[PDB]
């Protein structure tokens, strides 16, 4: 467990200072790699290597630089047909709640002073 | 004028840049049923017990706001993984882009536009750090956000709309206006023969949209009303 | 459908709390004091009862404003995707789309949509326009390559290299106004074949 | 427990509010921005061209290129041009004219073209067409055919 605390720096108390808080409990790496479990403020968490959990920044992806003149073009000699999957909801579990049996079932008087 | 044999088609043309700001996400607040009540007293906490889960309903639903605000911005800014770069060498045939482009001479990243986004629109934060209201900040900070951004322009003026479909494939911006001006159904001799006249709409287009911003605040309303 | 159980589960749950009255079973306080006394601990019962409905009424409605915006977005993608073909980059899935699959899925769909991206590619020179005859010539589809010998004319999604001719061009303009133009000779098939004639 | 509970349904009203702009941002991020849309005043007033997104506190900023004309002028058109008998309709844009020869050209700018066979295409006949002119369609391969 890495226990975390917003908008404070490290007062009471592998005990680091982030732009979120005080972070203790976790350790950390300066290396960068894909996040899994966020916190804020560009940092996350994962478990990692005799394990724990380690703390680190953001990494945005594979930088790479583009070559870019004038008389330069590239064109594709090949191709390739992939598949992929977009998921989406449409409806959802209908429920019917009925106001005398929810509120006040079995009762004569009671069902008489709801009305 | 209403003929039958009579037509009117266009002989000159200019290139207009319009503004529209859309808001992404707003400020993760969290606020706990127990200290809105009363801290350190355990008569709040006996009298607030006896309702029930109102407390995990509404602290659950605090955090999916949360971070379902965080996935609107995830879903936006990044639509790829891969980082681009902006070259060194700068030929694009006679445009300036360096107002929307970063300036590596700042201490933090930004472009002179973005430069004028952050300024004009309102420490405070401090001021709500002091009375117990929590602001949680955002997953991503500004220059992680400004990188993304860095990224799609860096992209665009280079690779363009290859990306999206593939690989980024490298063509010259000049040839990039030949095929946007062929799919609206426009032949590229206008911006062959036009492209000194365009260059010049453009420049002073993007000098009118600074003076607009610097000048006009009230042009960011939509994200002042949030 | 996690949500959906947990909101059920914490709605039935919610009946066990006692809501400021001596017991949550409503026989055992209608069994012992009299109507008189026993209408403020019903009435407490009431209120908060009916707050805790007026709750999840409004919060599974939410979800139904939820519901609404994914359902216009999946009608629309079940419009555009499906049934024609959408010209709309990253609606239909990453890369230029072709053609889509429906499965029912419960309580929603799953889209398998295929697409066409591209693969290997190769570094060419280009040029923006030809000058043969001192007139400028212009490529109706595509753009001008080269290998570094000749210049081709190919499509930008595929690469098809064929031979520069008048069909594949249209004249118009001249050399001295495009920036970039290079010096080569337009293929033209009727000379070949009034020579042989 | 009653104000907090008005609170928090305001912000689950106001969440629904900010998704559908970022849904909306989404989408004017991918056909704006990533690719070229056609769709008018989508992507803004005009024909769109490209979009450049520029980064702003709790929200987005996209500068717009399009094409919007200037300047015109009335001219005299015409269905169809009637030479050897035949309909010749445009295969590209719509047939303008001076008040002298009849010129073809595209209909997002002025530029020009005489008649030759390979910018128009004969379909039917003059008679069943409404509005047909009469004109000579110059044959580009007559004068080097002649001069061979």
Same mark, same amino acid.
């Given at each position: 467990? #890495?226990?975390?605390?917003?908008?404070?720096?490290?007062?009471?108390?592998?005990?680091?200072?982030?732009? #979120?808080?005080?972070?203790?409990?976790?350790?950390?790496?300066?290396?960068?790699?894909?996040?899994? +479990?966020? +916190?804020? #403020?560009? +940092?996350?968490?994962?478990?990692?290597?005799?394990?724990?959990?380690?703390?680190?920044?953001?990494?945005?992806?594979?930088?790479?630089?583009?070559?870019?003149?004038?008389?330069?073009?590239? +064109?594709?000699?090949?191709?390739?047909?992939?598949?992929?999957?977009?998921?989406?909801?449409?409806?959802?579990?209908?429920?019917?709640?009925?106001?005398?049996?929810?509120?006040?079932?079995?009762?004569?008087?009671?069902?008489?002073?709801?009305? | 004028?209403?003929?039958?044999?009579?037509?009117?088609?266009?002989?000159?043309?200019?290139?207009?840049?319009?503004?529209?700001?859309?808001?992404?996400?707003?400020?993760?607040?969290?606020?706990?049923?127990?200290?809105?009540?009363?801290?350190?007293?355990?008569?709040?906490?006996?009298?607030?017990?006896?309702?029930?889960?109102?407390?995990?309903?509404?602290?659950?639903?605090?955090?999916?706001?949360?971070?379902?605000?965080?996935?609107?911005?995830?879903?936006?800014?990044?639509?790829?993984?891969?980082?681009?770069?902006?070259?060194?060498?700068?030929?694009?045939?006679?445009?300036?882009?360096?107002?929307?482009?970063?300036?590596?001479? %700042?201490?933090?990243?930004?472009?002179?536009?973005?430069?004028?986004?952050?300024?004009?629109?309102?420490?405070?934060?401090?001021?709500? %750090?002091?009375?117990?209201?929590?602001?949680?900040?955002?997953?991503?900070?500004?220059?992680?956000?400004?990188?993304?951004?860095?990224?799609?322009?860096?992209?665009?003026?280079?690779?363009?709309?290859?990306?999206?479909?593939?690989?980024?494939?490298?063509?010259?911006?000049?040839?990039?206006?030949?095929?946007?001006?062929?799919?609206?159904?426009?032949?590229?001799?206008?911006?062959?023969?036009?492209?000194?006249?365009?260059?010049?709409?453009?420049?002073?287009?993007?000098?009118?949209?600074?003076?607009?911003?610097?000048?006009?605040?009230?042009?960011?309303? %939509?994200?002042?009303?949030? | 459908?996690?949500?959906?159980?947990?909101?059920?589960?914490?709605?039935?749950?919610?009946?066990?709390?006692?809501?400021?009255?001596?017991?949550? @079973?409503?026989?055992?306080?209608?069994?012992?004091?009299?109507?008189?006394?026993?209408?403020?601990?019903?009435?407490?019962?009431?209120?908060?009862?009916?707050?805790?409905?007026?709750?999840? @009424?409004?919060?599974?409605?939410?979800?139904?404003?939820?519901?609404?915006?994914?359902?216009?977005?999946?009608?629309?993608?079940?419009?555009?995707? @499906?049934?024609?073909?959408?010209?709309?980059?990253?609606?239909?899935?990453?890369?230029?789309?072709?053609?889509?699959?429906?499965?029912?899925?419960?309580?929603?769909?799953?889209?398998?949509?295929?697409?066409?991206?591209?693969?290997?590619?190769?570094?060419?020179?280009?040029?923006?326009?030809?000058?043969?005859?001192?007139?400028?010539?212009?490529?109706?589809?595509?753009?001008?390559?080269?290998?570094?010998?000749?210049?081709?004319?190919?499509?930008?999604?595929?690469?098809?290299?064929?031979?520069?001719?008048?069909?594949?061009?249209?004249?118009?303009?001249?050399?001295?106004?495009?920036?970039?133009?290079?010096?080569?000779?337009?293929?033209?098939?009727?000379?070949?074949?009034?020579?042989?004639?």
């Amino acid at each position: 467990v #890495a226990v975390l605390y917003q908008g404070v720096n490290c007062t009471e108390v592998n005990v680091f200072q982030t732009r #979120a808080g005080c972070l203790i409990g976790a350790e950390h790496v300066n290396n960068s790699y894909e996040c899994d +479990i966020p +916190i804020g #403020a560009g +940092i996350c968490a994962s478990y990692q290597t005799s394990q724990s959990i380690i703390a680190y920044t953001m990494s945005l992806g594979v930088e790479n630089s583009v070559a870019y003149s004038n008389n330069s073009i590239a +064109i594709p000699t090949n191709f390739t047909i992939s598949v992929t999957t977009e998921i989406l909801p449409v409806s959802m579990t209908k429920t019917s709640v009925d106001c005398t049996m929810y509120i006040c079932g079995d009762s004569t008087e009671c069902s008489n002073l709801l009305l | 004028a209403y003929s039958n044999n009579s037509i009117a088609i266009p002989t000159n043309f200019t290139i207009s840049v319009t503004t529209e700001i859309l808001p992404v996400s707003m400020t993760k607040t969290s606020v706990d049923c127990t200290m809105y009540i009363c801290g350190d007293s355990t008569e709040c906490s006996n009298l607030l017990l006896q309702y029930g889960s109102f407390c995990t309903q509404l602290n659950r639903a605090l955090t999916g706001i949360a971070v379902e605000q965080d996935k609107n911005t995830q879903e936006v800014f990044a639509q790829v993984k891969q980082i681009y770069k902006t070259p060194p060498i700068k030929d694009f045939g006679g445009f300036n882009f360096s107002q929307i482009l970063p300036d590596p001479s %700042k201490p933090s990243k930004r472009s002179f536009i973005e430069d004028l986004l952050f300024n004009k629109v309102t420490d405070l934060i401090c001021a709500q %750090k002091f009375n117990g209201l929590t602001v949680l900040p955002p997953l991503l900070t500004d220059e992680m956000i400004a990188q993304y951004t860095s990224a799609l322009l860096a992209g665009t003026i280079t690779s363009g709309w290859t990306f999206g479909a593939g690989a980024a494939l490298q063509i010259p911006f000049a040839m990039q206006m030949a095929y946007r001006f062929n799919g609206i159904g426009v032949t590229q001799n206008v911006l062959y023969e036009n492209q000194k006249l365009i260059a010049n709409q453009f420049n002073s287009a993007i000098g009118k949209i600074q003076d607009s911003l610097s000048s006009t605040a009230s042009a960011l309303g %939509k994200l002042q009303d949030v | 459908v996690n949500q959906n159980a947990q909101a059920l589960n914490t709605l039935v749950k919610q009946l066990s709390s006692n809501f400021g009255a001596i017991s949550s @079973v409503l026989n055992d306080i209608l069994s012992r004091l009299d109507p008189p006394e026993a209408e403020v601990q019903i009435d407490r019962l009431i209120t908060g009862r009916l707050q805790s409905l007026q709750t999840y @009424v409004t919060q599974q409605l939410i979800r139904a404003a939820e519901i609404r915006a994914s359902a216009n977005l999946a009608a629309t993608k079940m419009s555009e995707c @499906v049934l024609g073909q959408s010209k709309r980059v990253d609606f239909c899935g990453k890369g230029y789309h072709l053609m889509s699959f429906p499965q029912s899925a419960p309580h929603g769909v799953v889209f398998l949509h295929v697409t066409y991206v591209p693969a290997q590619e190769k570094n060419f020179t280009t040029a923006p326009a030809i000058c043969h005859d001192g007139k400028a010539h212009f490529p109706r589809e595509g753009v001008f390559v080269s290998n570094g010998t000749h210049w081709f004319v190919t499509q930008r999604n595929f690469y098809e290299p064929q031979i520069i001719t008048t069909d594949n061009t249209f004249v118009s303009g001249n050399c001295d106004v495009v920036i970039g133009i290079v010096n080569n000779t337009v293929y033209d098939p009727l000379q070949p074949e009034l020579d042989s004639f």
